[PDB]
Amino acid sequence: AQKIAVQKDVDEVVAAAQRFLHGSGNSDEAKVDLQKKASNLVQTIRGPIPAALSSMEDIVKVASLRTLFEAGVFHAMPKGGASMTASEISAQTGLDKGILIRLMRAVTPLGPFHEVGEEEYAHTPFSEAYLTADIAGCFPVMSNFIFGPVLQICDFLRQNNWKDAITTRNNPFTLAHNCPGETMFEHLYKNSKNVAPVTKAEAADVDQIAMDLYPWEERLSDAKGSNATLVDIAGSHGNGTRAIMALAPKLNGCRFIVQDLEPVIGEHSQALRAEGIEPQVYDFLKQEQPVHGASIYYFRRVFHDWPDLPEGKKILDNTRAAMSREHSRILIHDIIVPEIGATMSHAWQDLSLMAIGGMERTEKDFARLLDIAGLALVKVWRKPGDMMGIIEARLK
Amino acid sequence: AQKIAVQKDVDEVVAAAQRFLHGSGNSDEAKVDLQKKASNLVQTIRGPIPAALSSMEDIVKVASLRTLFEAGVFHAMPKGGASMTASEISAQTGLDKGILIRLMRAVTPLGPFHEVGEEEYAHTPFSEAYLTADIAGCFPVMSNFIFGPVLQICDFLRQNNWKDAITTRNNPFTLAHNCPGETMFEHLYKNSKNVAPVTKAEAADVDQIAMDLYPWEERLSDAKGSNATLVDIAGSHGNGTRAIMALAPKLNGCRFIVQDLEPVIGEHSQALRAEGIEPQVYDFLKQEQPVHGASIYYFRRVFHDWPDLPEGKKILDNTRAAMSREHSRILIHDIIVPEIGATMSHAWQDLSLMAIGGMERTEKDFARLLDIAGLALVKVWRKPGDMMGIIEARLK
Numbered sequence A, B: 001a002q003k004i005a006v007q008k009d010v011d012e013v014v015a016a017a018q019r020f021l022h023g024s025g026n027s028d029e030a031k032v033d034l035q036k037k038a039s040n041l042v043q044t045i046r047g048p049i050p051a052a053l054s055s056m057e058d059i060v061k062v063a064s065l066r067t068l069f070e071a072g073v074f075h076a077m078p079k080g081g082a083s084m085t086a087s088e089i090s091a092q093t094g095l096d097k098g099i100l101i102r103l104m105r106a107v108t109p110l111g112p113f114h115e116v117g118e119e120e121y122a123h124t125p126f127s128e129a130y131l132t133a134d135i136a137g138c139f140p141v142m143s144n145f146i147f148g149p150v151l152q153i154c155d156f157l158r159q160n161n162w163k164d165a166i167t168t169r170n171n172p173f174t175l176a177h178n179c180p181g182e183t184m185f186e187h188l189y190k191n192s193k194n195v196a197p198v199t200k201a202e203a204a205d206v207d208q209i210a211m212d213l214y215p216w217e218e219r220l221s222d223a224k225g226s227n228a229t230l231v232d233i234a235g236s237h238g239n240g241t242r243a244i245m246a247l248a249p250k251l252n253g254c255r256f257i258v259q260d261l262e263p264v265i266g267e268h269s270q271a272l273r274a275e276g277i278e279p280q281v282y283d284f285l286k287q288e289q290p291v292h293g294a295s296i297y298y299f300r301r302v303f304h305d306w307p308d309l310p311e312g313k314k315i316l317d318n319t320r321a322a323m324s325r326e327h328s329r330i331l332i333h334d335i336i337v338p339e340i341g342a343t344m345s346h347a348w349q350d351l352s353l354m355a356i357g358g359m360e361r362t363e364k365d366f367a368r369l370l371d372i373a374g375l376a377l378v379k380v381w382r383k384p385g386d387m388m389g390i391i392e393a394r395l396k
């Protein structure tokens, strides 16, 4: 039968595991191949037609995780694998015991929970992972505000006959949230009860961005006086700055600045001052870059929020204003998408940004963004196996 | 490292494959265990926190499949694995080449397509499966009308503080489609351009429902005159009737009836008459069962659309009207959900029905539906490994 196909796919899984289990630390390519072959084996087991039903399984699973997390089922359940009944869970959260039982059927068969017995469930480390800092900031915001729009990508493109009408202020997010005209940050910050959850999600860093990719000690110490300064534009929480103060520590009493919109600077001002950095409110769309002539202006996970034109050039030009030609420099820190062999990690970030008019850029895409803004490529800082790179640039 | 955990999970995959590859045909339990262990291996490879990002990967993948299918990318691409470029695809569909490239990143790394080279893609049998009858009827309707509501299950339950306010006419479907008051069939049939796609999706039968589970030859041949009759209520296309005429063929010139709402009977009337069955319009909510005293009244994949009360009892009572006490009989054909060990196949059907006020029932749930409508359990017809059973019932 097809039992032949299962057998060949199991062989490839074993072969890939053996490769992965004897490679060194050189996020490996072996690790992703083993995932790939594991995935093939499932699909082959299911067969082509039944595997096309995995979109409906996937959708209800996400919908059930989102509901269970929002209704406090994850927090009500004993961390550590101890069991708890539907009735107990229903009592402590007020989620209808009938809905809860139905919802649990999507997150126990394979899902991150364990069905210990009838109406009886336990955490596993995969469910409890939804409680960690990274996931707990990131998942509720994505599921309450972003998943809906992403699903509506098709509807938005349909209205323009599959043409790219997508903009920062007219996109599947404005369509789904019925807010044409507002960018996503505008719409979320407008309601103050979103500021805490959104700034937490902005702190999410599941893949642990490599901040030692660039020599902060070198460029910042050869900086006399006013050039000994680093601006972390749309710095948000500041963790990127903390990590740069944590990647060169022999400081010549240096100036460390974190600019962001008002409600963000509000949330982190006290904690940023405390750690000795200075919080200033700034809008790289309306205003020009206040701090003149700093050795670097640093952009981490900002430019994937914006298209080349208009906002892209407007960012780069509003801060070209304050740059010394020969002594200031611009650093763009973002995913660098390969032109072939992209992973699901590129895909989910890029396509979620599609819903708000953003986009992850290839190396060629960054080249055109520089050209359009009259900037010279200095160096593309990559430590391969990193998805992030740093685009270093000076004024032409 | 964790390399220990990968190794133990690979061993369980191999062990489960060996079990599956030496079992007989007794939809196996071995087949699902091997899927389970394959799934564990992926999750272990990724580690708990990064695996919690698979909700965002899953959402963009569904969103990208839906867009690519709706924009005709599946139909433009050479069936059989021959490659085609982004530009070629973009030319034949009018989908923006830039959107297309971005979208393809979600369906090539593991997705059902193959990235042959830069901007170059091929079908596989897993992508082409989206073109078969079953998937092509079922997937567009689910993705255009159902996925949205399912994601909004959380929003709906939130409005009532996680309490079950869900009804046939007030539910995540009415919330998402802004149509409070209308049931789902009402809302979709209201626009006539939905009738063809929805009736096709109603014909979907990916898991191939077992129609030989019940002895049609026996009960229908011991039927004299007016009792030699079968009513396929909400029969829709008729395939269930065709299969009953295709599971007993020594007919005493018998009467085969397919009742459904008007726009459905319209689509299938000509093709139903041709095959010698009679199409009559009937609404098991408004009217009483016209055809009196038939040996069976047959319900396939209807009752999971409706709650016990109100519509559930109203169905069973509107057709109790036409039943002979001792010679008519009721057959309910639906998934029978186990109280433990449900699969993702139960879960996606039950939780998608949640969005419209429907539900898949356990054996105990069917017991209460009978009690509430004054019907006696005759026999629960199950051939285990079938997810469907038949609930046989007579008037108490």
Ligand SMILES: C=CC(C)(C)[C@@]12C=C(OC)C(=O)N3/C(=C/c4c[nH]cn4)C(=O)N[C@]31N(OC)c1ccccc12
Pocket: A134, A138, A141, A142, A146, A184, A198, A201, A202, A203, A204, A205, A206, A207, A301, A302, A304, A305, A349, A350, A352, A353, A356
């Ligand atoms: C919703 C959360 C925010 C606002 C923060 C987010 C913005 C980001 O750009 C500035 C970002 O980097 N994000 C995430 C990074 C992450 C999480 N774990 C590991 N890396 C993330 O979850 N969501 C996002 N992201 O995705 C690329 C988004 C996609 C569509 C709208 C908004 C966003």
Ligand SMILES: C=CC(C)(C)[C@@]12C=C(OC)C(=O)N3/C(=C/c4c[nH]cn4)C(=O)N[C@]31N(OC)c1ccccc12
Pocket: B134, B138, B141, B142, B146, B184, B198, B201, B202, B203, B204, B205, B206, B207, B301, B302, B304, B305, B349, B350, B352, B353, B356
């Ligand atoms: C959208 C398609 C319809 C209207 C037909 C559908 C109705 C069904 O009940 C009468 C049904 O049986 N369905 C399917 C069966 C199937 C497909 N492949 C293998 N079995 C299916 O895809 N969708 C549904 N279903 O799911 C249980 C639904 C869930 C929420 C709303 C509407 C439905």
Ligand SMILES: Nc1ncnc2c1ncn2[C@@H]1O[C@H](CSCC[C@H](N)C(=O)O)[C@@H](O)[C@H]1O
Pocket: A185, A202, A203, A233, A234, A235, A236, A237, A240, A259, A260, A261, A264, A282, A283, A284, A285, A286, A299, A300, A301, A302
């Ligand atoms: N018009 C604007 N001017 C300045 N900052 C803006 C802005 N619009 C959005 N931002 C900020 O850009 C940030 C992007 S997410 C945080 C990025 C941060 N540097 C990090 O890598 O973790 C948000 O905190 C948001 O408030």
Ligand SMILES: Nc1ncnc2c1ncn2[C@@H]1O[C@H](CSCC[C@H](N)C(=O)O)[C@@H](O)[C@H]1O
Pocket: B185, B202, B203, B233, B234, B235, B236, B237, B240, B259, B260, B261, B264, B282, B283, B284, B285, B286, B299, B300, B301, B302
């Ligand atoms: N009020 C109503 N009265 C009668 N039929 C209805 C109805 N509301 C919905 N239906 C029908 O019930 C059917 C359910 S799906 C088709 C089921 C079919 N017996 C099969 O197993 O393939 C739909 O075709 C729908 O039109």
